[PDB]
Amino acid sequence: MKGILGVKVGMTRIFRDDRAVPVTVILAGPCPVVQRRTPEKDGYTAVQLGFLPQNPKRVNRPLKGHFAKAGVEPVRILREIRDFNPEGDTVTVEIFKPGERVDVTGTSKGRGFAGVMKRWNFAGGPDSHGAHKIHRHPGSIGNRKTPGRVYKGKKMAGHYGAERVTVMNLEVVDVIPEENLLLVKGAVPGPNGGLVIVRETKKA
Amino acid sequence: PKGVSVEVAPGRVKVKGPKGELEVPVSPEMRVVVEEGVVRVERPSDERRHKSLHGLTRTLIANAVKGVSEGYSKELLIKGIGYRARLVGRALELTVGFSHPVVVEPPEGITFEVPEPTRVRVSGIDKQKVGQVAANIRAIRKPSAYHEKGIYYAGEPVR
Amino acid sequence: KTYVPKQVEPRWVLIDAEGKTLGRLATKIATLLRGKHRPDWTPNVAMGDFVVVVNADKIRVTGKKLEQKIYTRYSGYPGGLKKIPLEKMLATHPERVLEHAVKGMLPKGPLGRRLFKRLKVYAGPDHPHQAQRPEKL
RNA sequence: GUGAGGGCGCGAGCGAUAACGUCCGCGUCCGAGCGCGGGAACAACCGAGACCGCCAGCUAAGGCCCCCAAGUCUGGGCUAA
RNA sequence: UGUCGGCUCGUCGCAUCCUGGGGCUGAAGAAGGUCCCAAGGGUUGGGCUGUUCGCCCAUUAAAGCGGCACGCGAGCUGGG
RNA sequence: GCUGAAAGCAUCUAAGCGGGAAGCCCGCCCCAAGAUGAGGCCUCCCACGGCGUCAAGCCGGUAAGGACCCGGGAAGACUA
Ligand SMILES: [Mg+2]
Ligand SMILES: [Mg+2]
Ligand SMILES: [Mg+2]
Ligand SMILES: [Mg+2]
Ligand SMILES: [Mg+2]
Ligand SMILES: [Mg+2]
Ligand SMILES: [Mg+2]
Ligand SMILES: [Mg+2]
Ligand SMILES: [Mg+2]
Ligand SMILES: [Mg+2]
Ligand SMILES: [Mg+2]
Ligand SMILES: [Mg+2]
Ligand SMILES: [Mg+2]
Ligand SMILES: [Mg+2]
Ligand SMILES: [Mg+2]
Ligand SMILES: [Mg+2]
Ligand SMILES: [Mg+2]
Ligand SMILES: [Mg+2]
Ligand SMILES: [Mg+2]
Ligand SMILES: [Mg+2]
Ligand SMILES: [Mg+2]
Ligand SMILES: [Mg+2]
Ligand SMILES: [Mg+2]
Ligand SMILES: [Mg+2]
Ligand SMILES: [Mg+2]
Ligand SMILES: [Mg+2]
Ligand SMILES: [Mg+2]
Ligand SMILES: [Mg+2]
Ligand SMILES: [Mg+2]
Ligand SMILES: [Mg+2]
Ligand SMILES: [Mg+2]
Ligand SMILES: [Mg+2]
Ligand SMILES: [Mg+2]
Ligand SMILES: [Mg+2]
Ligand SMILES: [Mg+2]
Ligand SMILES: [Mg+2]
Ligand SMILES: [Mg+2]
Ligand SMILES: [Mg+2]
Ligand SMILES: [Mg+2]
Ligand SMILES: [Mg+2]
Ligand SMILES: [Mg+2]
Ligand SMILES: [Mg+2]
Ligand SMILES: [Mg+2]
Ligand SMILES: [Mg+2]
Ligand SMILES: [Mg+2]
Ligand SMILES: [Mg+2]
Ligand SMILES: [Mg+2]
Ligand SMILES: [Mg+2]
Ligand SMILES: [Mg+2]
Ligand SMILES: [Mg+2]
Ligand SMILES: [Mg+2]
Ligand SMILES: [Mg+2]
Ligand SMILES: [Mg+2]
Ligand SMILES: [Mg+2]
Ligand SMILES: [Mg+2]
Ligand SMILES: [Mg+2]
Ligand SMILES: [Mg+2]
Ligand SMILES: [Mg+2]
Ligand SMILES: [Mg+2]
Ligand SMILES: [Mg+2]
Ligand SMILES: [Mg+2]
Ligand SMILES: [Mg+2]
Ligand SMILES: [Mg+2]
Ligand SMILES: [Mg+2]
Ligand SMILES: [Mg+2]
């Protein structure tokens, strides 16, 4: 269960052998192990992977002790990877081979208080004959006296986006260890700078 | 029950013989007597479910014996041109009208044999087992109800 | 004027569950859950005995049940009437089977929920080795 | 004062040996006893006619394993859904 | 207690239109008939009419039936 | 479909056992301990200094650490 952190740096397109392929560019810098939690010490297997460096003054938090507990440069962010205890003290882009497919989770862009139509791509309403009151309007929502209420989770407008989205089976394109870079099949959640994770997909 | 080694437990009976030992889950409210060098069984009453239970264990016990006695073996015939079978060590691979050669796993306590490309016996030590194994084979390619193909036990033709 | 009880110390109890009829057990568990068995009873105060049950999975049940019994779990969502057979419960978290039982037998009142706390259930045995452990049948 | 009555059991017409249907009759309750117990709740089904008090006592219908008062009562049969 | 149809949003039922599995066949094979199991999902665009309904064109795996005050006028329309 | 009695035969069942659905449970994805049944892990700070005889509390100062304010954001009505 391979797992390494990184951030979306941007995306252009390359040329495979004689065909064009849009690809996204992630950056998987060294992620220092911080806490290999075993089932004995917790109940599940995992690894705390750090990331970006830090002004030692900002991390005056007890984090100092946690860092020193493993003896590592104060990173900025660190998360876990379920069922994954590899080796050494650091993971890298060497983990992924050009051909393996990966799952990347990210934080979708926040579309604020988005309208029903924008949100769940509804139909809206007549722009012509109908009263200029319900153009982008959910219209009906329920029934008469029975049931009298609204089905919980009924698609309605509101703050939408800026959440956890997982795209799957993106094939690992050309990976350049020379700079801790990683190329994937393009469509990746999150803006250009969001903290994303890259794991191992489930084809079989 | 000759040359057998029937040994009684609380809710089960362990029978041993030339072929080996085998466990047979015996009903609760039944008396598994062991008179002389043979075995007897009685029932606590004369009701409906108890008649059934008795006769059930009655044979079920005789099966454990025969199982480690002379053993169990059923035969399998095969009709049709390409319809054949090639024994491969334990498991047996037989092409019987499918683009993919059929690979048949050999369960424990069972060793089907192949004297001919058509005939295939089913050696074992348990009726429940041989019973399923035999069916498992016919299940692969049931007989063509319009002529002669597929794998048969040894019973009449479907015509 | 009828006796006016005061603060009473929690009398814990250790009860089995092997080969025990789900219902016949829970009944007593409830009966004794509240101080209903102690002649110094008082509905107002709520001073029941801390009942702890062990060997949950062991519980016996009659007829189809295992295959028949069905539990109802309705989330507030459309088609969320998700229901679970008895067996499944014995597979997942078996302790529930007795819980929901006793649960349904304690008074619907808010102090009944307070009595539900006085009810600890596992299957091992092996309880949280505290102190009290008055075995019973 | 009243001159819309209603439910119910029973005997009949109409209805379709339909209707919380309808139209007479004999009685009954509700009406006006939505006061109490039972029936999960419930005008009329079962019990029973509230002058006021009481931290007494038997019983009615129903009920006596837990929510729930009071038998996991006693003895003898049937039923595995 | 706003009354058709339309729009918008659906959700539930199963007596299933499709896809799933299965029995029988007057089932060679293909294709089909009929019955049983089975809602998880799906179940088109258009001509005419206010229409529902239906007829028709082209296609479709199929172009399902019905409940929700024949769902929905403090959501819309207003042809009826 | 197996073993198989009731019911010497027979039978897929009455004990038991196997195979078998786009369905169910799990698996995938998302929320999630207000799971008041408030879970777990790693790390940081630690005494009352004074009344309260007890029990139940209060007070000014602190620690780790947080808040306010300010510049600002693919985050955003507001707040977060
Ligand atoms: Mg936008
Ligand atoms: Mg859009
Ligand atoms: Mg959209
Ligand atoms: Mg939609
Ligand atoms: Mg539209
Ligand atoms: Mg208008
Ligand atoms: Mg106008
Ligand atoms: Mg207007
Ligand atoms: Mg309305
Ligand atoms: Mg002997
Ligand atoms: Mg004999
Ligand atoms: Mg069973
Ligand atoms: Mg079972
Ligand atoms: Mg669902
Ligand atoms: Mg209340
Ligand atoms: Mg008059
Ligand atoms: Mg009459
Ligand atoms: Mg009238
Ligand atoms: Mg009348
Ligand atoms: Mg009258
Ligand atoms: Mg009166
Ligand atoms: Mg009167
Ligand atoms: Mg009167
Ligand atoms: Mg009143
Ligand atoms: Mg009553
Ligand atoms: Mg009453
Ligand atoms: Mg008096
Ligand atoms: Mg009395
Ligand atoms: Mg009585
Ligand atoms: Mg009662
Ligand atoms: Mg009796
Ligand atoms: Mg829609
Ligand atoms: Mg749905
Ligand atoms: Mg079919
Ligand atoms: Mg068919
Ligand atoms: Mg055929
Ligand atoms: Mg033909
Ligand atoms: Mg659904
Ligand atoms: Mg149109
Ligand atoms: Mg037109
Ligand atoms: Mg035209
Ligand atoms: Mg027109
Ligand atoms: Mg039209
Ligand atoms: Mg027509
Ligand atoms: Mg056509
Ligand atoms: Mg509908
Ligand atoms: Mg309508
Ligand atoms: Mg309407
Ligand atoms: Mg309107
Ligand atoms: Mg309308
Ligand atoms: Mg309305
Ligand atoms: Mg006009
Ligand atoms: Mg007109
Ligand atoms: Mg007109
Ligand atoms: Mg047969
Ligand atoms: Mg027989
Ligand atoms: Mg037979
Ligand atoms: Mg047969
Ligand atoms: Mg039968
Ligand atoms: Mg399946
Ligand atoms: Mg499947
Ligand atoms: Mg689920
Ligand atoms: Mg002091
Ligand atoms: Mg204090
Ligand atoms: Mg602050």
From Swiss-Prot, chain A:
Classification via Pfam families: Ribosomal_L3
Gene3D superfamilies with a match to the protein in the record: 3.30.160.810, Translation factors
GO cellular component, one term: cytosolic large ribosomal subunit
Bilayer-spanning residue ranges: none
Any GO MF annotation of the entry: rRNA binding
Gene Ontology terms describing biological process: translation
Keyword Ribosomal protein in record: yes
Keywords carried by this UniProt record: Ribonucleoprotein, Ribosomal protein, RNA-binding, rRNA-binding
InterPro entries: Ribosomal_uL3 (IPR000597), Ribosomal_uL3_bac/org-type (IPR019927), Ribosomal_uL3_CS (IPR019926), Transl_B-barrel_sf (IPR009000)
PANTHER family the UniProt entry points to: 50S RIBOSOMAL PROTEIN L3, LARGE RIBOSOMAL SUBUNIT PROTEIN UL3C
NCBIfam families documented for this protein: L3_bact (TIGR03625)
Assembly notes: Part of the 50S ribosomal subunit. Forms a cluster with proteins L14 and L19.
Its biological purpose: One of the primary rRNA binding proteins, it binds directly near the 3'-end of the 23S rRNA, where it nucleates assembly of the 50S subunit.
Family assignment from sequence similarity: Belongs to the universal ribosomal protein uL3 family.
Protein name: Large ribosomal subunit protein uL3
Gene: rplC
From Swiss-Prot, chain B:
Keyword Magnesium in record: no
Gene: rplF
Name used for this protein in its record: Large ribosomal subunit protein uL6
HAMAP family: Ribosomal_uL6_B
Chain's role: This protein binds to the 23S rRNA, and is important in its secondary structure. It is located near the subunit interface in the base of the L7/L12 stalk, and near the tRNA binding site of the peptidyltransferase center.
Gene Ontology terms, MF aspect: rRNA binding; structural constituent of ribosome
NCBIfam families xref list: L6_bact
Keyword rRNA-binding: yes
BP terms from Gene Ontology: cytoplasmic translation
Quaternary state and interactors: Part of the 50S ribosomal subunit.
Species this chain originates from: Thermus thermophilus (strain ATCC BAA-163 / DSM 7039 / HB27)
Gene Ontology terms: cellular component: cytosolic large ribosomal subunit
Matching InterPro entries: Ribosomal_uL6-like, Ribosomal_uL6-like_a/b-dom_sf, Ribosomal_uL6_a/b-dom, Ribosomal_uL6_bac-type
Keywords for this protein: Ribonucleoprotein, Ribosomal protein, RNA-binding, rRNA-binding
Highest taxon in the source lineage: Bacteria
Similarity-based family: Belongs to the universal ribosomal protein uL6 family.
From Swiss-Prot, chain C:
Gene Ontology cellular-component annotations: cytosolic large ribosomal subunit
GO-annotated molecular function: mRNA binding; structural constituent of ribosome
Residue ranges of the TM segments: none
GO biological process, one term: translation
Entry keywords, A to Z: Ribonucleoprotein, Ribosomal protein
InterPro entries linked to this entry: Ribosomal_uL13, Ribosomal_uL13_bac-type, Ribosomal_uL13_CS, Ribosomal_uL13_sf
Superkingdom of the organism of origin: Bacteria
Pfam family, one: Ribosomal_L13
Assembly and oligomerization: Part of the 50S ribosomal subunit.
Protein task: This protein is one of the early assembly proteins of the 50S ribosomal subunit, although it is not seen to bind rRNA by itself. It is important during the early stages of 50S assembly.
Protein family according to the UniProt entry: Belongs to the universal ribosomal protein uL13 family.
NCBIfam families: rplM_bact
Name listed for the protein in its UniProt record: Large ribosomal subunit protein uL13
Source species taxonomy: Bacteria, Thermotogati, Deinococcota, Deinococci, Thermales
